[PDB]
């Protein structure tokens, strides 16, 4: 038996990739637009957190990472890094 991937492509991979792209969009927002960039970063993190919940619905509670878990975790790291990057930029530009 071999698994089909239309479900996981449409509902998990593409949304995660697009949320990562939207996290990148914060870099192109002008600096000093602090509410906009902060809201974008943190709400992208919230959306990624919401998306990461449906990854394990099919699976049992196995205690090892899977490919989907790795992908979602890396996307979460990317959006987290974008938000922390803007935080560092704002802190070092303010002073």
């Amino acid at each position: 038996l071999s698994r089909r991937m239309g479900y996981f492509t449409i509902q998990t991979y593409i949304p995660c990739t697009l949320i990562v792209v939207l996290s990148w969009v914060s870099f192109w927002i002008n600096k000093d637009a602090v509410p906009a960039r902060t809201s974008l970063g943190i709400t992208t993190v919230l959306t990624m957190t919401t998306l990461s919940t449906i990854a394990r619905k099919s699976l049992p509670k196995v205690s090892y990472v899977t490919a989907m878990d790795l992908f979602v975790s890396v996307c979460f790291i990317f959006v987290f890094s974008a938000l922390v990057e803007y935080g560092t930029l704002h802190y070092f530009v303010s002073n």
Binding site: V21, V25, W28, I29, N30, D32
Partner: peptide
């Protein structure tokens, strides 16, 4: 993404104030 592209080309950080007349170009 369209809003991001729009904002990239926005020069002034202040919006129109109503009273001031806009000289159309």
């Amino acid at each position: 993404i369209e809003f991001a592209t729009v904002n990239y080309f926005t020069k002034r950080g202040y919006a129109w104030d109503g009273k001031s007349v806009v000289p159309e170009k």
